[PDB]
Design a protein around this ligand. Sequence first.
Ligand SMILES: [Mg+2]
Ligand SMILES: [Mg+2]
Ligand SMILES: [Mg+2]
Ligand SMILES: [Mg+2]
Ligand SMILES: [Mg+2]
Ligand SMILES: [Mg+2]
Ligand SMILES: [Mg+2]
Ligand SMILES: [Mg+2]
Ligand SMILES: [Mg+2]
Ligand SMILES: [Mg+2]
Ligand SMILES: [Mg+2]
Ligand SMILES: [Mg+2]
Lengths: 209, 176, 38, 140
Amino acid sequence: MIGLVGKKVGMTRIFTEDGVSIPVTVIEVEANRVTQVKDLANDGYRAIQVTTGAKKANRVTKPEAGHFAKAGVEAGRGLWEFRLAEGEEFTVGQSISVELFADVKKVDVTGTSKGKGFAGTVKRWNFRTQDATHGNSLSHRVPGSIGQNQTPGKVFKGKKMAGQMGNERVTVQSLDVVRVDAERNLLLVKGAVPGATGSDLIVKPAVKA
Amino acid sequence: SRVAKAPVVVPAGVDVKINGQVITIKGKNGELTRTLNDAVEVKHADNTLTFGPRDGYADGWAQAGTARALLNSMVIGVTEGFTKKLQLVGVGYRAAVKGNVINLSLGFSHPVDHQLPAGITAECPTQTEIVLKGADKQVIGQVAADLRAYRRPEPYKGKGVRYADEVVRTKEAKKK
Amino acid sequence: MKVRASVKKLCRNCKIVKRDGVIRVICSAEPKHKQRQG
Amino acid sequence: MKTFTAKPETVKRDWYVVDATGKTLGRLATELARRLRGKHKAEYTPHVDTGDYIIVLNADKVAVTGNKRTDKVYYHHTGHIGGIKQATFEEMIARRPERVIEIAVKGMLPKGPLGRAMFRKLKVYAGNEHNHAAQQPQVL
RNA sequence: GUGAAGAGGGAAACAACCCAGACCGCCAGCUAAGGUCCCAAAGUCAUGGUUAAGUGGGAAACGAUGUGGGAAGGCCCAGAC
RNA sequence: GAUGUCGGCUCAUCACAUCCUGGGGCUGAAGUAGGUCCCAAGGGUAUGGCUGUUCGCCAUUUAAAGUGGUACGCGAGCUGG
RNA sequence: GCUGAAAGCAUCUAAGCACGAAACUUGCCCCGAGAUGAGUUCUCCCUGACCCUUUAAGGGUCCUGAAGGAACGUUGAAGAC
Ligand SMILES: [Mg+2]
Ligand SMILES: [Mg+2]
Ligand SMILES: [Mg+2]
Ligand SMILES: [Mg+2]
Ligand SMILES: [Mg+2]
Ligand SMILES: [Mg+2]
Ligand SMILES: [Mg+2]
Ligand SMILES: [Mg+2]
Ligand SMILES: [Mg+2]
Ligand SMILES: [Mg+2]
Ligand SMILES: [Mg+2]
Ligand SMILES: [Mg+2]
């Protein structure tokens, strides 16, 4: 229900003396429907849209054929919405970078968390510690595992044993958008935004309510 | 025995009808139906109606009483037009109507508007009185309380919308 | 107050004590007084 | 020598469309179960495969017992502890009535491999003559 | 009396409890205890009655116009409830 | 022919006879605050002084500083008072 | 709480209806078709000859080898591998 393009760095807009404003400025070029899912066939509602167009000279055939209407055009990713009334485009019939959000609404940036990698019980969950007075073997690190005793230890498949942090999605949810820039598509948000450099990102509407 | 039920006239307007179980009545008032239980076997000669218990089963015989009465009320409702009124007491308390939305200014920060179901309107002869009235006695009852319920009378005073009959004078003397 | 087991019913105007087993002595028709199931 | 019982691999595929579109629940299950194992037995034997395909229509309708419509849970317990332990009543079965009946008809199976790959010969379906494609071609 | 020093069938599982004492072999019959809707062998058996709580399928004092049956009484078609 | 004690740390998981918060009935319930009983386990549920303490008393917080089961949870995880 | 029998009344229950909490189902975020019940939709690629069998089961040779995948290399806000 709104384009989705990569972000790049974050800034500050100081006027009237906020400066607190920590813009994310995540460029959102053209979208282009490319496909329109519907009731009969395609399954549910939905409405694909590849809000990109990065020159992809070398691409596998099926995707290179995945386009079909007027200009053709090619991108890479491929999202969609659901209920609405979006066009029947292909990578033709541009959507817009100025989705209908008026000027003061909260967006819902969605990206993939950075990736720490394998991480201890110390970093994964703030529950860990241990002291330094003695027994340096189990220093301020290793936990004291699943309690219980004779209960064979079904370990209750959780606690927080060390494991990689993941890159999993995040969806900050609720973020008032400050600027958009109709033609110089950037759209600034207020801090947050997961991932780095130029992760795909999604930037939904305002479902958070 | 000492109780039962047998009478149920069908004067003018009384256009009762039965569809196996269903019973739709008509008249000066409105269109009210009420499919009774299953065993139920009600009919109509020319004037008297009569419930029909498939047989003398415990939960089958008494099922007649509650039935020979419900339909009867349907007739008494369709011909007379049911009324019931409550009164509001307490400073600030007011009354008002605008078709359905019976705006109510009881004692909260902001007033409200109880939208009454269809078949029963209401009129505030004054900012203190509210008189609901409709056909089906059912929606009548619930809305009768659904309204006063917006502020039940408290003993110490009595304030709060009350039925225009509620014996409750006031409290039992206070204390601590 | 609303008891758990059964403290009889006492008084005269108390509820018919009929329903889903509701005893509690009190004597309804006591605009304020009302010792019962709760 | 003498001689067996003959139930090689058999072959009695079927299409029996057990509608059970009404008050037939509970006990009704036994027939869907027994007709799955082969009760009349044209040749069958409790031990050979073949559930003898059946199709229970509607299903989303059953008078149930005398009151287990509002009073009986199923109880599943997921797996991830946290003592979640799921519980749902019957009148609470509005998202997938098809589930039930199939649930009931189960357990009454030999329990294990044979009776396990024998359940599918039911086809849930909660909406009378619909997507009868499960075997649209032939039936009974 | 049984187990110990006893196997088989039953009580879900269960040395001792119920049935019952395994010389071998049998794709042959009748029974015991216990059972016959499915798992799971055999009555979705019949004649009648109880229950409506899933009682059956855990637990007392005591409580209650639940509902079944039997007997005796108080007022009352000079009219009771 | 070895099932390592109490307390602490770490990290817990469940019960409900609920401490806080949520919804109610009565009150010797004006209000505010309470008393008690019913319902309710979503989530939450203190830092220190003294002592090995658990606990406790004390200082000061808090919406509150719950009771209990888990080999009086937790040493092939730490400590060793 | 409405309406209302059994029980002429009355009665929140027996039929039927109406409210009603951080509990329950959902709403929000993540995983998620090995969902073997392995689902859906869109797009891409392959249309050369013969033989022996115990012939509908195949077994086998030459000519072909696409879409794609992988391999290698330069690497990464990705990572123990
Ligand atoms: Mg050491
Ligand atoms: Mg185990
Ligand atoms: Mg078995
Ligand atoms: Mg010995
Ligand atoms: Mg015999
Ligand atoms: Mg059998
Ligand atoms: Mg029981
Ligand atoms: Mg409790
Ligand atoms: Mg302390
Ligand atoms: Mg211990
Ligand atoms: Mg050690
Ligand atoms: Mg020491």
